[PDB]
Structure formats: structure tokens, C-alpha cells
Amino acid sequence: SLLPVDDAINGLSEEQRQLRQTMAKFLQEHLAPKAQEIDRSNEFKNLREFWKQLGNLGVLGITAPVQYGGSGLGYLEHVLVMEEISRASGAVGLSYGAHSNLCINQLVRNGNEAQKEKYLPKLISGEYIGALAMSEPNAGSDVVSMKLKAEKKGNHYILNGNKFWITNGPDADVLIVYAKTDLAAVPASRGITAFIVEKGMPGFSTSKKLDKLGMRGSNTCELIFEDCKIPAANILGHENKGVYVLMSGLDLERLVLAGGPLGLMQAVLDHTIPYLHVREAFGQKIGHFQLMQGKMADMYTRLMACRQYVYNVAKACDEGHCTAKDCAGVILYSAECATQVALDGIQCFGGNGYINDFPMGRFLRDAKLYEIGAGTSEVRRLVIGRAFNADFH
Amino acid sequence: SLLPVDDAINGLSEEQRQLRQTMAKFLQEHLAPKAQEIDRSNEFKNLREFWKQLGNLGVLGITAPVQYGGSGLGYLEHVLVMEEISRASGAVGLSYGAHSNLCINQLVRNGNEAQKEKYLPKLISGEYIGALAMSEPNAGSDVVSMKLKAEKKGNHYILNGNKFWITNGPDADVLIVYAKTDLAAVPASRGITAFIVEKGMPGFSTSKKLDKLGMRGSNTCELIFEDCKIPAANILGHENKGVYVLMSGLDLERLVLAGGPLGLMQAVLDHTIPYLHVREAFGQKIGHFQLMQGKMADMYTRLMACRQYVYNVAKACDEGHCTAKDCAGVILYSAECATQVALDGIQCFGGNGYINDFPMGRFLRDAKLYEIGAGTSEVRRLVIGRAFNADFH
Amino acid sequence: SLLPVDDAINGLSEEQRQLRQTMAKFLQEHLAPKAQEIDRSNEFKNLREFWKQLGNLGVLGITAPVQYGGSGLGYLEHVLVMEEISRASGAVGLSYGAHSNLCINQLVRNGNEAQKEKYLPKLISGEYIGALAMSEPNAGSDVVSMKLKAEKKGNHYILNGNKFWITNGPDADVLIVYAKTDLAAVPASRGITAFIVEKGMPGFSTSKKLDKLGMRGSNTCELIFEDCKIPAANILGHENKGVYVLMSGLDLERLVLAGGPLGLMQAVLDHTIPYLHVREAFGQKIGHFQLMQGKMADMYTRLMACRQYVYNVAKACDEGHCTAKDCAGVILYSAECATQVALDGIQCFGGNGYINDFPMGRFLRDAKLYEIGAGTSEVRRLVIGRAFNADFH
Amino acid sequence: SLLPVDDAINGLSEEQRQLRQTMAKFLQEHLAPKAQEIDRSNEFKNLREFWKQLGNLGVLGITAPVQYGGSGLGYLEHVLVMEEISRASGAVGLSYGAHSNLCINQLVRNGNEAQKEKYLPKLISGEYIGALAMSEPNAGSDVVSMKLKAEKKGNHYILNGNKFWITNGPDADVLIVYAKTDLAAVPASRGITAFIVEKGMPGFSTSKKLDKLGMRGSNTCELIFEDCKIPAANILGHENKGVYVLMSGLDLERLVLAGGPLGLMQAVLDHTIPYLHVREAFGQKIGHFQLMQGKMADMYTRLMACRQYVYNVAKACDEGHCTAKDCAGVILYSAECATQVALDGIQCFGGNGYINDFPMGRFLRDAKLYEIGAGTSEVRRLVIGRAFNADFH
Ligand SMILES: Cc1cc2nc3c(=O)[nH]c(=O)nc-3n(C[C@H](O)[C@H](O)[C@H](O)COP(=O)(O)OP(=O)(O)OC[C@H]3O[C@@H](n4cnc5c(N)ncnc54)[C@H](O)[C@@H]3O)c2cc1C
Ligand SMILES: Cc1cc2nc3c(=O)[nH]c(=O)nc-3n(C[C@H](O)[C@H](O)[C@H](O)COP(=O)(O)OP(=O)(O)OC[C@H]3O[C@@H](n4cnc5c(N)ncnc54)[C@H](O)[C@@H]3O)c2cc1C
Ligand SMILES: Cc1cc2nc3c(=O)[nH]c(=O)nc-3n(C[C@H](O)[C@H](O)[C@H](O)COP(=O)(O)OP(=O)(O)OC[C@H]3O[C@@H](n4cnc5c(N)ncnc54)[C@H](O)[C@@H]3O)c2cc1C
Ligand SMILES: Cc1cc2nc3c(=O)[nH]c(=O)nc-3n(C[C@H](O)[C@H](O)[C@H](O)COP(=O)(O)OP(=O)(O)OC[C@H]3O[C@@H](n4cnc5c(N)ncnc54)[C@H](O)[C@@H]3O)c2cc1C
């Protein structure tokens, strides 16, 4: 089943501990017995029903203001929920992260009153699924070099181009898309502008879902725009100032999505330790051998260290302290440790770890993503280094 | 395409270099454009035709005596061919290794004249596919604790039980099976006996092929024996002395299968470097950035070091020097480095590395096996440590 | 100078932040300009004066009850002070840790009222220097196999034997020594008994200080007992029950001494980052190159992660939650990361890092200890593994 | 003593094996019982006598032509001798490397007939000690940015400036110095010119020897030139073409000095394994525990892999194949593995490993150099990456 989580060390209040317990129980009831089928089929059959169920719990829009139906909690609760969902299933965890943190949080931070009232209630209730589009086939890490055109004609902007790697692409009812309004600006950051593109608008179509190594079931597609007219009302923040929105979104995205590797490491431990104490070779349980004890110690220590790092940084960001380098470092460290722990878990399982009946391969394939998505490891290292360069200069 | 391989450093004679070139050309013509389809379908459609083609080249039974149609070459040529095939496709490489090294080499080393004449010609020609069975559901690394029964009645032994994880299981026409004839021997090693079980004998049936994380297409099944009568003529070596056969086979198996990680690392480099010099971000090729240059340096140095280690140890074993600890260390080091290089290659590709259109995920999933098959990493470390314990004691 | 420490992320209250600032200022004034001389001379000239100065601040016996003059604070403050002192100088940090945590804490936890009143005031004031003796030349990690004899004659126990590796050995006025009273007990743990041996008693002499690779200046010697008569009043806890005292002391020792690697990593960062932004090669500061930025990112992330882990575990232990495996894991992770960060700092400095004028070599040599002292890394891994074995069994 | 070296795997001919045996015997007789004293005193008392003894064996100038008294052997023999000397003592190994490879090889490759006849006989015989000067206080890795001035007046060049980090500085009778003749050349490489500066010339003085972390005893100083007049006859190669000489020297320097880490790893194994089979804890030798067996396996495999890499690359370079990237990679891999093995050896020794009586700390401090000297690790990674960039461009 699910190993107990020592919340005394994590320094979680009673309310947060209750939230974790409720989420764990609900996910073990509903999401957990479907993870293998989701991975195999590369499709979540009950995505909308599950989204409604999550909306009933209030985890969708957990950081959204109460007036729109949100829980109005902090980022620590958000990473708790994200960690639990990723523990239950990696792909559903990624889809939930993209829906809540990327879309709802961006709306509540950089949205007009009318836009909030129009979109947030349905997104929080779970009726609408959200997504964020900033990457392009030629501009994945160099986001400011996007090629999407957002020329302005009359009172409505006309969009042409395509965006790539959009999580929840084909299923999104509300999408936040970054486009370059001013292609002739001297700094490419100035040209960027954020728009709210909703499903059904003429010219907005999506390609077929991608076939991915891991995180299968989190529908990822390519957005296609052909003379799609976006009314001026659907503009986040202000025109030609979407770079700041993009950067703040990136910081909070890294901070929240750092919860995913925590969930994957917790799942690896949950499946490894009981097996190590059940499987026996050479006349005793394989867990009694010194090498396996060392493996368990390494996995446990890495998980605990990353968990403490993420929780403390989230607590700090709740107060108001948000620095780019810390938000990069948390996810960088968590992703690397998660990949190592997943490989170690496959090794501990051994022969049975290499077949698809056991979920260790799924854990490895899911964990490999977080070193690539939301900016690769090299990008995060450069961000931290440049943050150091800002001082002592 | 295929990057050039510096054979001047490897210290390969002209004949071996010609062998490598011929194998590379043939595999690029035939096997290479089928690797992705083999991985996706979990089945090699042209396995028997490809085996006949390999038999025409003589790579099957490359170490077998010439009188049976073999090339009569050394282990260095064997690891060369294994490396090339693994470079073309990991699963076919594993199947070839199991066919040649595990079966044909065991026959030529521990077989009677009649058994050799009966089996070797067809195995070398490619008409028959070979396999070796020593692992069981409860005895994977603790091989001496196998439960297969080999009771002797009259002049024919009767077998009951099942063996697990047999490469080339469903397709094998000749199989070498280890069974415990004397279940009451004080040392479990004494009870073990090797038998030649051929396809079609009553009571010998195979289960459905496994669904594996990687190496998909190398048909792995479970052998089922129910009152199968094996004539006494089908005994390798001598009765109750199969432990020595098993150990020598394990040593040579590790030495030859160390060529697989070399092929996988070479494939990772072949697909990574041109892409790093084609894909461009921030106004220049991504290969020009210092972090990517460091990644390339690490991958190249690890590949070269492992290649030199394997080649030198194979050359030594050709002369007659075969020590258990060296044969363990070569594959241990190669497997660990191969896994690291595969992860690094996925990272270098980035977003495109995570989709199944590009083969980086396939390389990672294939490379993870060699830390598990032919004895896990922990077993090899214990073997080396005990080899040290033998001295200074 | 000293880089700022982000206490917002660490979740430190205002009082603890003030404590850290006061300690940093005092150490930068007094201890810091003497670290190189202490390392070179292998001797702290002003040890007693510095101990009196520390006693004035109250850091000595920071966890001791107020009635004896202690501050009566928690373990978090203790690791804060230990981290600051280790940041100023590793050897003085180790000496302070041995004086406070090993001696004073053991006295306040497992001491009679009379023993407390006799010893604690002077130890806290700084007049007396404390030390703990549990390791022997043949029993370093296997502590229960100590050979020190503690035979009982009349009302006073007579001690014969020798203890090794005692920090603050030659300078200790009060020493806590573990000896085996009952050498014939079936479990060796039962024989162990703790005694309070004070300087000047006949038969108690110390050898010459050791010449160590690092931590030079923390006087380490060998205790020699020859028919030394210890009165029965000088017994910690109860006779033949010192094993529990030893184990609790080991747990708290690991928890507090985990602060040392934090100080060493902080010092490495403090000396590395400004130099990386001052030294210039190829026409720009070496800190602007991508490889150096990656090095800085790795060092910073490792430091932050270990700091969060240690602080959260100390906070938990303050409440009352103290588990052996967590207290082992904190120091294990911290020590390994500290060694890696020290090597990285030497590399970043380059040529100047290899000379003794710069402190990078001192940082490496000091950091190597924490993987050896207070139980090696292998012992901690075994402790964590056995803690897992206790459950699921 | 000295563990046997498996030369069957290394593929060494009988002559090379005899050379290794003779060098090992001689060094164990003379150099070995002095290593600790050399490290402690930071001075080799018998440097000149030992140099004469080495000249008698012919190891000095082993690659030099026979007509000057050299052995006329290849680079493989050179790395063999370097490895043996480094195994005996790291500092003497570095001094020998600087004397032979840096000076004598440079003379035999880029020297006039008169210069060869004047200098080589005495350098090979051991009467003169050689050294190479290319690094400066501000130009360590950016060698082309050296500031030494070599203005030409009449028929003799006048030198002003200073060079730093010169191995065998104070003891060198012949020195090869690189200076910038044309400070106004558009490429800084064109300005560089190589000179032969001999001891005793007016204006040429040396500073006090450096106090280093490791490699103590290899006298390293700073060269000081003040209006030193160098006759035009003392020019290596041709004027304003010393960049090619410098680069070829760097390549061969890396290739030969890669033998040093091999010697250090061999010494670590030689001191670790017997101790692991003598020291006993928990009622058995510490070498029998699984963790220690894993440590031994890792150390042995890393040593063997690096040894095979270096030997094969040296064999290739003997034939005529010398590529920059391979010569960089060999030393990069060897240095990193040597540092890891030294740390592991200190850990295996444990408490005794931390004192200066045992040589494990000396091995670590010596091994740390090769990641810094002869170009740091980052420089080598950049060299390999740029070598890849040259192709596919
Ligand atoms: C499963 C999945 C889900 C995704 N979901 C989303 C989503 O919801 N929203 C979204 O916007 N995107 C999403 N993405 C895309 C992802 O955010 C980007 O693709 C990622 O940041 C890298 O994109 P890329 O491969 O184009 O980077 P590339 O630029 O193509 O990467 C090239 C390589 O070079 C390295 N590199 C790049 N620049 C430098 C440099 N300056 N110095 C050194 N090295 C460098 C990179 O680390 C990488 O290894 C998703 C991707 C995946 C796989
Ligand atoms: C794709 C594939 C192909 C295969 N092909 C073949 C084939 O052709 N022929 C064949 O005979 N087998 C084959 N196998 C099986 C393989 O050889 C064994 O399964 C492998 O050696 C490990 O088996 P296991 O999982 O049962 O080991 P387990 O004993 O179940 O492993 C348990 C775990 O404990 C560790 N462990 C075990 N003993 C110790 C110890 N004493 N100390 C410390 N740690 C220990 C192991 O490393 C492992 O991590 C194949 C397996 C795979 C996945
Ligand atoms: C014991 C010893 C013996 C020596 N003997 C000799 C000798 O005989 N002859 C001789 O000529 N020299 C000798 N040296 C000097 C040595 O060759 C150089 O000092 C070395 O190459 C580095 O010098 P540096 O510290 O000045 O490099 P720095 O440039 O000061 O190094 C700064 C740091 O930045 C890194 N860095 C530099 N450039 C880049 C870049 N472009 N991108 C990324 N990172 C970068 C470096 O790796 C290093 O970590 C010796 C040094 C020592 C310690
Ligand atoms: C600077 C310094 C200060 C010190 N200060 C103190 C002090 O104040 N108080 C004090 O009591 N001690 C002190 N010590 C001693 C220290 O606590 C012990 O020496 C340490 O725990 C290891 O001792 P050892 O070398 O005898 O261990 P050993 O048993 O000799 O170590 C042998 C090696 O085998 C490994 N090993 C041991 N058992 C096992 C096993 N079961 N399985 C696998 N591997 C195993 C160990 O990790 C080690 O690598 C100090 C030591 C130093 C260097």
C-alpha cells in the first residue's frame, strides 16, 4: 500500500496533514488502480469525471481566491496535492499541474476582473480544463525567440503560427498562449504578449496527441492557428509586456512542479521497500544484505532531503519571498534525485523490475521528464549562475 | 549515419577491422531500418531469415571450430560482432548473443563428439536457434537454488518444473537447460546437471512472450516441463558436474555480452553528435555551448575507456588468461557507463528525446538491461570482492 | 567577507536569526583571523581564553538548563552555533562540538543532581573543558567490543586500559569514559558502563597529540588508565546500563555534528564566489563561463538542500521526535555533500587553490573527517537499513 | 609490499614487462622508504644523486635518440616509468615527468643539431635537471595571454617579466621558456616564441619554493627575469612560431602525465587491500563485509579501465596517430578516477586513514593535482568539445 509519511519532520500543520491524508485516501481509491492502464493506453478515459471529482475536493484552484470558489491556500498545499497526485500517477500529476498552476494561477495573478469572473469559476469547478502554451518547435528553451504572430487589425488581434508541446492540448477549453505582437522590437522580450484563447474559436485546431517515452496519458499536442481572430478583451496583463508574466509563471511553475519528483520518489520507495522485505534469495530476505541496505539508505536520504528543500522553499514563497535561483534549484535538485532513485528502484527489483507488469519502469520513464520539461537542467543551472552573476558585479 | 570508429587506438588488426566494416555495412543495410518497428511491435518478423543471412556471413558460431562450419576466431571478433549488432538494434543484439555465446560456445566447450556433430552444423548455419536456460522464478541470482527436477528412470531422465527468463525461448530449436539431478547433495552445486533439450519433445512447452521495458523483440518466455523424458545421450559434460559448466559459461557470457553496452553507447553518440551540430538555439548550434561540450566530452571518454577495457580483456582471454573478476568487471563498468551515457543522450536531445519517434528512449530502455541480466551489478561486485578475498587469506 | 545567509528560507525565528548574527560577528572578530595559523601550528594557543569568551556568550551549554547557567535552548540553536564556529574554523568547531554536545548534554541527560551541580557550572562557564571517550584502537565502529576494564573493588571502581581518538584529550578537565564492567555478560552491550573521569586522578595520563590530515588544532590524544580508582559516585546513569546512554549520545552527536559540514560548505561558498567574480581569464571573469556557472549552481543547491534537511530534523527533535535513522541520514548526506563541495571549490580556485595560502585545501581536509568521525558512512548506511528492517518484519 | 600487476591484460611485450619489473624493484629499494619524509619535509634531499641513478638506468630521456645516450623507446615505456615513479612517490613522479617529457622531449622534437648536442647529453645523463615554463600569474589556462616580454636588440633577445608555477624551478639547469616576441600581433599565438634559458645567466633568478597542498617535494617556484639577454642561438623551432611547439608539448605532456594518476591508484590499492584483509571488526576481517567488497570492486575496475585506456592510447601514439582530443581525454578520465579512488581508500582505512602516519592522505593530496595541472578539467572538456565541433561544421 502507501508507506506512512513522517509529517513531524516536514513541519506541516494539522490542516496540511489532514489535506495530505484526504488526498492520499481519495487517490488510492480512484486514481491508483488506473495508473498502469493509463500508461498502457496513453489515454485517461475518465479525465473529465476525475476533474469534476477533484473540483469537488477543491484541489483545483487551491491557490485561487475564495470568491471564485477556490480554497485560497498557499503554495505549500499546492505542492502537497501535486506530490500526492504524482505519487498516484505521474501523467495525471502533470496534467493537474498544467491545469492548476499554469492556467488558474496565471489568471488570478495577471487577469482583469471580467476575465477572472468569466473563466475562473468553471476552471476551478472542473468543467473547463486549462493549459499554457509558450513553447514552439524551434523555440523550446529560447522562449523569447517564438515565431507566433499576433498582428492587430481593428479591435481584434489575428493569430497565425503554431505552438508545440502543450500539455492538456486537445482537452483544453481555456488556453493561455504567448505570441509576439511586435516582431520588430529591439529586445525580443518586448514583442511578447499573452492571450486567452478558448476552444472553438475559428482557426484554432489541434494536432494528434504525441507518443511519449513516459507521462503517457497526459495529452500533449501541437496548437495550430490560421487567421484566428482574438478579441482585444482576451489579453493577460498588458500588450507588449507578457515577458514579465512569462517569467513569473516560469518561477511558480518550477516551484510547484518540483512536487512531481517528490511524488515519484515516494512511489518508488512505497513499491521497493515491501518487496525488498518479501523477496528472498540465498536463504534470507534480499533486504538484509548490506548492498540493499545501502540502496535503501541512499533512496530514503535523497527523498527526505529533497522533500525538506521543496517544503521550506514553498513556505518561504508563501510569506512573499520568491527568488528565481531558489525556485530553479528546488526543481533541479528534485529532478536529478528522482531520476537516480527511479534507476535504483528498478535495480532493487531486478528481473521483475524490467517487465511492464511492475511499475518501476513507468516510474523511471515518468521521472526522466522533469529534467526536460519546464526548462532543462542546463537552463536551470544557467539561471542560478546568472543570479549569482547579478551580485558581485 | 554511422560515425567512424578509430580502430588505430583500439589496436585492431586489419582482418578485425575488415570484419567490423563488413558487419556495419550489412547491418546498416538490413537490420538498422527495422529497429524502431521491432521495438514497437515487440516482435522480429524476419528472425529466421535474418538468422540465415547471419549464418551466410559466418558470424553465427564465429568462435566455433571450422570443421563444423564456424569461423574459428577469438572472443575479440565475437565482441566486435556483438557490439555492431547491438549498435544496429539492442534486442537483436541480445538475441544473437544468447544464440551464439550461450548455446554454441557451450556446446563446443562441453559437448561430446556426437552431440557436436548433431547440433552444431545447424546452429551455425542458422537453421536452428539456440538458447540457454538457468534462471527460475525463485532462483535468478542464486542459481544453485534452482528447483527443476531431473530424476533418472531407466536410461532417460524425466524432467519436471519450469525455467524463467529464457531469451529466444519460443523460437529456440535447441536449448541448454540446467537441472538438479541430486536434490539431496550437501552442496547444492553438486546436484546441478546440464541437459540438451530440443524443441518438440513431449512435455516441453513455452508460455507467452514477456512484455519488457526494453529489449522488446528479443522473445523471452518461460519454459514448462511436465514429465519430459530426456535421453541420457543429451547430457553436457558429466552428470552432477554441471556447476563448472555453468560457471565457465557465466564468465564467457559476461565477457561477450559486455559488447552490448559498447554498441548502445556508440549508437547514442551516433545519434547525438550530428543533432547537437544541427539543432540551434540562442542564435547558434547547441553544440557550441560549454555545457553541451562537456556532455559530449563525458560521453566520448566513457565510451572510449569502456571500449579499451573490453577489447584488452578479450584479447587476454583469447591467449588463455581468463579470470572471473576481470570478466565480471568489464561488464559491470560497461553497463553502468552505458546507462549514464543513454540518460545523457536523452538530455542532450531534450524535448525530441522524450518522444518515441527518436530512438534515445529506446537506447535508455535497452541499456538498463545489462545492469540486470547476466547477473545484477551487486552480484558482480560480490564476485570481484570474493576474488580479492581468495588472495590475502 | 561573509556572504549573507537567507534565513527566510530556513524558517528561523527572529531570536535564532539574532543568535546567528551575533555568533557570526564574534567569530569574524576573534576566531576567523586565526584559522590558518591554527591549522599550520596544529595548536590553538588561546583555547582556554576563547572558551571563557564563548562561555560569556552562553553558547557553551546552550541546551543546558538555566539553573546551571545554560541558555536552555533547543538543538536548532546548537546546530546554528556549531555551523557558525565550523564556518570560522573547522578544528575549533569540532572541539566545541565535543565539549558541548558530547559532554554537557550527556551530563544533563544522564546525570545525578550532585554530579550536575558539581560539574555543569564550570563546564558551562568555560573553566573546564569536556570530552567523551568511547573509541579504542581495536574498537572504533564496533563500540560494544571495547576492552577497557572497570573492575569493582570496595566502593571505588578500578580502571585499566586505554581509549583512543579522544577529542580535547590533553586539555579536558572532565571526561566521560565508557568501560566494560561485566566482561562476561552474554550481550556485550550489558557490560558497558559510563564513568566521569576528571583530570588529575592518579593513573590517568594522556599521550601526545595526533598529527592529523585535517582538523589540525583539535587536540586528539590517547587516554591511558593504569589502576585508576574511580569512586562509585562518578557513574552516569546506572551500572551495566551504559549502552542506552551511549546510543542516545550517538544519535544526538550525529544530529548536532551535522552542523559542521554545513559550516564548511558555507565557508567554501564564501571564498569561492567572490573569487570567481574577481579572477578573469580569456578577457572576462571566470564566473561568466557556463562550466563555472554550473559549478556554482551545484554547490549552492547542495548546500541549501543539506541545510534545510538538517534544520527541519533539528526542529523535529526539539519537539520530541527523535528517530535513529533520521539522525544518521542528516549527517551522512551532509558529510558526503560537504566533501564534494570542497573538491569543487578547490577546482574552481585552480592553481591558487592548491597552495596553503588559500584555505580551500584546509576546507577539503576538514570536510573529509565527517565521513569518518562519529561513525563512518558505512555504519550510518547500515543503521538506516536496519531501521527499515525493523519494520516490515 | 607491491601487489602484482597483471601485464597479460595490459598487452605488454616481454621487454616492457622487464622494464616495469626493474623500475619497481629499484624504486622499492631507493625511493619508496623516503616518500613520507619527502612529503613531510617538502624537500628531496637526494634529488641530484637520485637523478644520476635514474640516468644510469636510462629512464631519463627514455624517448630520446640513442645517439645522445637515450633509450630510443616509445611513449608506452615512458608512461610505464612515470606510473612506477608516481606509485613510489607522487612528487618525485611529477618532477621526473617535468624533467623528461617537458624538457628532453621538447628538445628532441623542436631543437637544432647544435642545441641537441649541447644540452641533451647532460640532461639524459642526469647531470642537468630540466624544466618547462609557460604559465604566468595572470595566464594559467589562457596561455596565449602571457605577459613575458622578449624584445630583440642586436643579436641577443632581452627578456623581462616573470613566470609562475615552474616545476623543478630552483633546481633546473636548463629551462624552456615561452615568451611573446611580437606583442602587437593580431593573433596572440603568433607573438609567442620559445627560448632555452640556462641557469646562471645574469638577470635570471628564482623565488622561494611554494608550500603546496600535495606533491610536496617537487620544488615549484617563480622565475624572475630582469634584462636577461638570451642569445639568438637559444631559440627552439623558429621565431614567432612557438605556438605549435607549445601545443604539441601540451598534447604529449597530457599523454605522459596521465601515467601519474595510474601510479597513485595503484598505490592506493596496494595499501588498501592488505589492510582490508588484516583489520578486523565485528569478529571478522572488514574486507568480508559487502560494502567493503563493493568499494574494492569499484576501485579495481576504475584502475583497470583507466590503465587500459592510457596504454592503448600510448600504443596508438607510438605508431604515429596523435589526436588532441584523445590525449586530453586520457588524462581527464584518469585524474577524475584517481581522485575518487583516493577518497575511497581514505574511507576504507577509516580512522587510521586520517592520520599522517599512513599515506592515504598523501595519496589524496597528490591525486588532486592532476585535475589542476597540465590544464584543468574544464579546459580538457572544452578541448574535446571543440575537437568535435571541428567536424560536422
Ligand atoms: C512531456 C512534455 C510536456 C511538456 N509540456 C509543456 C507545457 O505544458 N508547456 C510548455 O510550454 N512546454 C512544454 N513542454 C516543452 C518543454 O517546456 C521544452 O521543450 C523544454 O524546455 C525544452 O525544449 P526543447 O527540447 O525545444 O529545448 P532545446 O533548445 O531543443 O534543447 C536542446 C538541448 O540544448 C540544451 N541547451 C539549450 N540552450 C542551452 C544553452 N544556452 N546552454 C547550454 N545548453 C543549452 C538543452 O538543455 C537541451 O539539452 C513539454 C515537453 C515534454 C517532453
Ligand atoms: C531481458 C532479460 C533477459 C534475460 N535473459 C536471460 C537468459 O537468456 N538466461 C537466463 O538464465 N536468465 C535470463 N534473464 C534473467 C537474469 O539472468 C536474472 O533474472 C538476473 O540475474 C536477476 O534475476 P532475479 O531478478 O531473479 O534476481 P533477484 O535475486 O530476484 O534480485 C533481487 C535483488 O537483490 C539483489 N541481490 C541478490 N542477491 C544479493 C546478495 N547476495 N547481496 C546483495 N544484493 C543481492 C539483486 O542484485 C537484485 O537487485 C533475463 C532477464 C531479463 C530481464
Ligand atoms: C603543483 C603544480 C605544478 C605545476 N607545474 C607546472 C609546470 O611545470 N609548468 C607549467 O607551465 N604550469 C605548471 N603549473 C600551473 C598549471 O599548469 C596551471 O596553473 C593550470 O593550467 C591552471 O592555472 P590557473 O590556476 O592560473 O588557471 P585559472 O585560469 O586561474 O583557473 C580559473 C578557473 O576557471 C576555470 N576556467 C578557466 N578558463 C575557463 C573557461 N574558458 N571556461 C570554463 N572554465 C574555465 C579553470 O578550470 C579554473 O577552475 C603547476 C601547477 C601546480 C598546482
Ligand atoms: C579527527 C578525529 C576525531 C575523533 N574524535 C573522536 C571523539 O571525540 N570520540 C570518539 O569516541 N571517537 C573519536 N574518533 C574516532 C571515530 O569515532 C572512530 O574512529 C570511527 O567511528 C571509525 O573508527 P575506526 O577507524 O576504528 O573504524 P574501523 O572499524 O577501523 O573502520 C574500518 C573500515 O571498515 C568499515 N566498516 C566497519 N564495520 C563495517 C561493517 N559492519 N560493514 C561494512 N563496513 C564496515 C568502516 O566504515 C571503515 O571504513 C575520532 C576520529 C578522528 C579521525
Backbone torsion region of residue C89, taken as left when φ is above 0, otherwise alpha when ψ lies between -120 and 50, otherwise beta: beta
Alpha carbon distance, N-terminus to C-terminus of chain A:
53
Residue of B nearest to D8 (CA): B316
User: What CA–CA distance (Å, rounded) separates D290 from B386?
Assistant: 9
User: What CA–CA distance (Å, rounded) separates B104 from B81?
Assistant: 15
* Cα D371 to the center of its chain, rounded Å: 12
Q: After which residues is chain D broken (C to N over 2.5 A)?
A: none
CB contact under 8 A, B329 and D389: no
Q: Count other C-beta atoms under 10 Å from residue B15's C-beta.
A: 10
Contacts of A36 (CB under 8 A, 6+ apart): A359, A362
Whether residue D33 lies within 8 A of chain A, CB to CB, comes out as no
User: What CA–CA distance (Å, rounded) separates A115 from A237?
Assistant: 11
**Experimental method, per PDB record:** cryo-EM
Residue with CA at minimum distance from ligand 2 atom 2:
B373
- Cell numbers placing A348: 532493487
DSSP string for A94-155: HHHHIIIIIIIHHHHHS--HHHHHHHHHHHHHTSS-EEEE---SS-SS-GGG---EEEEETT
User: What CA–CA distance (Å, rounded) separates C246 from C242?
Assistant: 6
CA distance C361 to chain B (A): 26
Whether residue D291 lies within 8 A of chain A, CB to CB, comes out as yes
**Which residue out of D77, D83, D84, D253 is catalytically annotated?**
D253
Whether residue C290 lies within 8 A of chain B, CB to CB, comes out as yes
Contact in structure between B268 and B345 (CB atoms under 8 Å): yes
Residues of A in contact with C301 (CB under 8 A): 329, 332-333, 384
* Ligand 4 geometric centre to CA of C142 (Å): 8
CB pairs under 8 A between B and D: 149
User: What CA–CA distance (Å, rounded) separates A77 from B271?
Assistant: 42
CB contact under 8 A, B392 and D316: no
For C374, phi and psi rounded to 5 degrees?
A: 55, 40
Q: At what angle do helices A90-97 and A75-88 cross, to 10 degrees?
A: 150
Q: CA geometry: angle at C91 spanning C105 and C365, to 5°?
A: 125
User: What CA–CA distance (Å, rounded) separates A158 from A176?
Assistant: 15
Q: CA geometry: angle at A230 spanning A226 and A236, to 5°?
A: 125
CA distance B291 to chain C (A): 6
CA distance B293 to chain A (A): 12
- The overall longest dimension of chain C from CA atoms, in Å, is 80
Contact in structure between D139 and D146 (CB atoms under 8 Å): yes
Domains of chain B listed by start with CATH number: 7-129 (1.10.540.10), 132-244 (2.40.110.10), 258-390 (1.20.140.10)
Contact in structure between D224 and D137 (CB atoms under 8 Å): no
Residues of D in contact with A289 (CB under 8 A): 290
User: What CA–CA distance (Å, rounded) separates C314 from C16?
Assistant: 13
Contacts of D166 (CB under 8 A, 6+ apart): D131, D132, D133, D135, D172, D175, D206, D220, D221, D222, D223
Residue with CA at minimum distance from ligand 2 atom 18:
B140
How far lies A269's CA from each of A346, A361, B152, B374, C393, in Å? 11, 14, 46, 26, 16
Give me Rg for the CA atoms of chain D. 21
User: What CA–CA distance (Å, rounded) separates A45 from A38?
Assistant: 8
> H or E segment at D227?
strand D220-231
Place of cell 544473437: B96
Ligand 1 pocket, Cβ-based, cut-off 6 angstroms: A 98, 132, 134-135, 140-141, 165-167, 212, 215, 220, 369, 372-376, 378-379; B 279, 281-282, 286, 289, 291-292, 347-348, 350-352, 354
* Ligand 3 geometric centre to CA of C284 (Å): 16
b/e per residue B328-353 (b: at least 16 CB within 10 A): bbbbbbbbbbbbbbbbbbbbbbbbbb
- Cell numbers placing D144: 596565449
**Which residue out of B84, B222, B253, B371 is catalytically annotated?**
B253
Interface chains of chain D (3 or more CB pairs under 8 Å): A, B, C
> H or E segment at D157?
strand D156-167
CB distance C220 to ligand 4 below 6 Å: yes
Contact in structure between A139 and A127 (CB atoms under 8 Å): no
Pairing of strands A220-231, A156-167: antiparallel
Residues of C in contact with A297 (CB under 8 A): 329, 332, 380-381, 384-385
Q: Count other C-beta atoms under 10 Å from residue A301's C-beta.
A: 24
Contact in structure between C204 and C140 (CB atoms under 8 Å): no
C139 annotated among ligand-binding-site residues: yes
- Cell numbers placing B89: 538494434
DSSP string for C276-336: HTT-EETTEEGGGSHHHHHHHHHHHHHHHHHHHHHHHHHHHHHHT---HHHHHHHHHHHHH
Report the DSSP beta bridge partners of residue B224.
B162, B205
- Cell numbers placing B205: 512447452
Alpha carbon distance, N-terminus to C-terminus of chain B:
53
User: What CA–CA distance (Å, rounded) separates C141 from C164?
Assistant: 12
Alpha carbon dihedral C160, C164, C170, C176, in 10-degree steps, equals -70
Whether residue C298 lies within 8 A of chain A, CB to CB, comes out as yes
Contacts of C99 (CB under 8 A, 6+ apart): C51, C60, C123, C129, C130, C131, C168
Report the DSSP beta bridge partners of residue B197.
B175
User: What CA–CA distance (Å, rounded) separates B172 from A87?
Assistant: 41
* Cα A381 to the center of its chain, rounded Å: 19
Report the DSSP beta bridge partners of residue C230.
C157
For C212, phi and psi rounded to 5 degrees?
A: -105, 160
Report which residue type is found at D234. N
Interface chains of chain C (3 or more CB pairs under 8 Å): A, B, D
For D222, phi and psi rounded to 5 degrees?
A: -120, 125
- Cell numbers placing D118: 649541447
DSSP string for C71-95: ----HHHHHHHHHHHHHH-HHHHHH
Place of cell 584543468: D376
Give the SS3 label for residue D62: coil
Residue of D nearest to C381 (CA): D291
Place of cell 481519495: A26
Contacts of A24 (CB under 8 A, 6+ apart): A2, A84, A87
Alpha carbon distance, N-terminus to C-terminus of chain C:
53
Q: What 8-state DSSP symbol labels residue A282?
A: T
Nearest ligand atom owner, CA of B377: 2
Nearest ligand atom owner, CA of D143: 3
List the 329-348 stretch of A: residues with Cβ below 8 A of C: 329, 332-333
Closest listed residue to residue D242, CA positions, set D119, D79, D126, D133: D133
Place of cell 520568491: A322
Nearest ligand atom owner, CA of D287: 4
CB contact under 8 A, B213 and A361: yes
* Ligand 3 geometric centre to CA of D375 (Å): 5
Nearest ligand atom owner, CA of A103: 1
* Ligand 1 geometric centre to CA of A239 (Å): 26
Torsion sign across C-alpha atoms C250, C251, C254, C259:
negative
Report which residue type is found at C59. V
CB distance D332 to ligand 3 below 6 Å: no
**Which residue out of A77, A83, A222, A253 is catalytically annotated?**
A253
B15 in catalytic set: no
CB contact under 8 A, A350 and B141: yes
Contact in structure between C333 and C309 (CB atoms under 8 Å): yes
List the 200-219 stretch of B: residues with Cβ below 8 A of A: 210-214
> H or E segment at C54?
helix C47-57
SS (H, E, C) C138-166: CCCCCHHHCCCEEEEECCEEEEEEEEEEE
